[PDB]
Design a protein around this nucleic acid. Structure first.
Ligand SMILES: Nc1ccn([C@H]2C[C@H](O)[C@@H](COP(=O)(O)OP(=O)(O)OP(=O)(O)O)O2)c(=O)n1
Ligand SMILES: [Mn+2]
Ligand SMILES: [Mn+2]
Ligand code: NA
Ligand code: NA
Length: 327
DNA sequence: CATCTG
DNA sequence: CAGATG
């Protein structure tokens, strides 16, 4: 957790670059288990050879830890923190809509910067276009004082469209958090479930409303159950308008809301421990459900939940307010 | 995993 | 449809 920090870190930068710049998925993948392993290792790695000793750790990495250990640096890492081509790919990639794949093409084509992007707004697809447009706003965190306003609005309109909706803003917003990155909303309706054959409007009616009143400003992606957009708090008495916010909306059949809802609320750490214990208590959990575990190895069968309360209950646990869902 | 693009 | 992004 700090006894093997640099090592795990350099390894990461290394790993990272493999996949993002080169295409070295294997390689990249190599750095990972490696940093993951040294990560757990109880001691102070004083040498390469000592490390090699670990699984996932071969010769080359060992060689690396050496030079790193031996000196406060690594050549190859030093060669990379410079290289303009590498730097560009990390940068371009910041644009929502631009992955690495794309990060590469652009650069090869000479687009390495934001200006480069605007100049060639044409090669950019819609999502990317927006991405470019709100680069700034996108990177800005979301102070909960805003969040509360957003939530206020979303909730009023969903309500208006149908009293039967059920919306929930999960995320860290949900877990207390002073500010979040984007707004995730869970959505269900009674008239939509596991079996129930579809009902797209269920999602669209609301999306519409939201833009009806201008909260939603753009659409990143709009499928029948998921919606990726942009929203924005009405700018008051003109002098101070709000940054544009990343927002997602998802239709979930009523019969699996809470597992979902529970799930989205994190934290990852709260998840696993919860899952780990579930396992003990004779169960299984995932994104959508909870199932009574057979002894034959495994087994399923959807245990019925009417709240986060039903779930915990199941695993015979202490109902955790969202705040304490931290770890 | 669900949506988009081409 | 494979392949990219989130
Ligand atoms: C799990 C982790 C999160 O609680 C949720 C997925 O939401 P995000 O990936 O957006 O993560 P958060 O909601 O935690 O992040 P943010 O700080 O962006 O709100 O599911
Ligand atoms: Mn988001
Ligand atoms: Mn979020
Ligand atoms: Na990106
Ligand atoms: Na292939």
């Amino acid at each position: 957790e700090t006894l093997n920090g640099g090592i795990t870190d350099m390894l990461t930068e290394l790993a990272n670059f493999e996949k993002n710049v080169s295409q070295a998925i294997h390689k990249y993948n190599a750095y990972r288990k490696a940093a993951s392993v040294i990560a757990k290792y109880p001691h102070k790695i004083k040498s390469g050879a000592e490390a090699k000793k670990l699984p996932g750790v071969g010769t080359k990495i060992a060689e690396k830890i050496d030079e790193f250990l031996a000196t406060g640096k690594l050549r190859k890492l030093e060669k990379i923190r410079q290289d303009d081509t590498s730097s560009s790919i990390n940068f371009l990639t910041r644009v929502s809509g631009i992955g690495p794949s794309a990060a590469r093409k652009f650069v090869d084509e000479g687009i390495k910067t934001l200006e480069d992007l605007r100049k060639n707004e044409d090669k950019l697809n819609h999502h990317q276009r927006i991405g470019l447009k709100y680069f700034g706003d996108f990177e800005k965190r979301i102070p909960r004082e805003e969040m509360l306003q957003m939530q206020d609005i979303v909730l009023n309109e969903v309500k208006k469209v149908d009293s039967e909706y059920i919306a929930t803003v999960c995320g860290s917003f949900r877990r207390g958090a002073e500010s979040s990155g984007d707004m995730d909303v869970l959505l269900t309706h009674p008239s939509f479930t596991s079996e129930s054959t579809k009902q797209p409007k269920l999602l669209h009616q609301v999306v519409e409303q939201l833009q009806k009143v201008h909260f939603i400003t753009d659409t990143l992606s709009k499928g029948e159950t998921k919606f990726m957009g942009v929203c924005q708090l009405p700018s008051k008495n003109d002098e101070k308008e709000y940054p544009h916010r990343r927002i997602d909306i998802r239709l979930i059949p009523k019969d699996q809301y809470y597992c979902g809802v529970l799930y989205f609320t994190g934290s990852d750490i709260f998840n696993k421990n919860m899952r780990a214990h579930a396992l003990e208590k004779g169960f299984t959990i995932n994104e959508y459900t909870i199932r009574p575990l057979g002894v034959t190895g495994v087994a399923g069968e959807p245990l019925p939940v009417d709240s986060e309360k039903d779930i915990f209950d199941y695993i015979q646990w202490k109902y955790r307010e969202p705040k304490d869902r931290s770890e």
